[PDB]
Amino acid sequence: TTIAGVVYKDGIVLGADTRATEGMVVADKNCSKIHFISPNIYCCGAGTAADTDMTTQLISSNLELHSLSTGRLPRVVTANRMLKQMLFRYQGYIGAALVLGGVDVTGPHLYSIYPHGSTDKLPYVTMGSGSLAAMAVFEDKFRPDMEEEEAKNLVSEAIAAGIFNDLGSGSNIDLCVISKNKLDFLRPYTVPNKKGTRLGRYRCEKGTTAVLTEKITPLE
């Protein structure tokens, strides 16, 4: 698990992998971890995935509701306020490491949210298990006001560090680019690792298994 984001000269770039690893066993290979908040605010989840899911449905429901009441665009500090108000109340028992990002009227805004309620604005964040390697990439090669292709390069390489250096990380890199007018969510950005092809054809045929009782019921 490695999620990261950055603010370039115009917008916000978000990136993650697709791995859910139950213990030391790979459960999922296509686990999307980037989630809708608003047409200008997304989030990235980490930790207890169901807690992140039921949180991010609730708050984006509250912003669909609230922005649907106000009749205008939401703000990033609103969702930041709701999350840091509720997680302090749930006292860290709900495990959710979050990356909040959105480009409102005031522009791009990025926050890192910890499950006890501590938040901060930073130009670049790395959360997850292999967040250390990606933070080394951002620290080594960060520059303010880079362009978005340099941003996609840096975020992609930063995820790739956790891909080839973390056990519980490494699959297809999901990206999203947010600007003042453009929203680009895309899951299959690259395939860094594949599966080897099979050699011995192990195909069994019909009749190699003893069946005790067969039952047929027609449908329509």
Tell which residue, 162, 177, 190, 175, has the closest CA to residue 34.
175
CB closer to other proteins out of 85 and 118: 85
Q: Cβ neighbours of residue 171 under 8 Å, at least 6 residues apart?
A: 17, 18, 19, 29, 30, 163, 192, 193
| Long-range CB contact pairs, 191-198, < 8 A, 24+ | 192/160, 192/163, 192/164, 193/163
Q: Does residue 108 contact residue 11 with C-beta atoms inside 8 Å? A: yes
What separation, in Å, do the N-terminal and C-terminal C-alpha atoms of the chain show?
45
Provide, rounded to whole angstroms, the least separation between the CB of residue 40 and other proteins.
16
Q: Which positions touch other proteins (CB under 8 A)?
A: 57-58, 61-62, 64-65, 68-70, 75, 77-78, 80-82, 85, 105
CB closer to other proteins out of 185 and 189: 185
Provide, rounded to whole angstroms, the least separation between the CB of residue 78 and other proteins.
5
Provide, rounded to whole angstroms, the least separation between the CB of residue 32 and other proteins.
14
CB closer to other proteins out of 81 and 116: 81
Q: Catalytic annotation on 56?
A: no
User: Which positions are annotated as active-site residues?
Assistant: 1
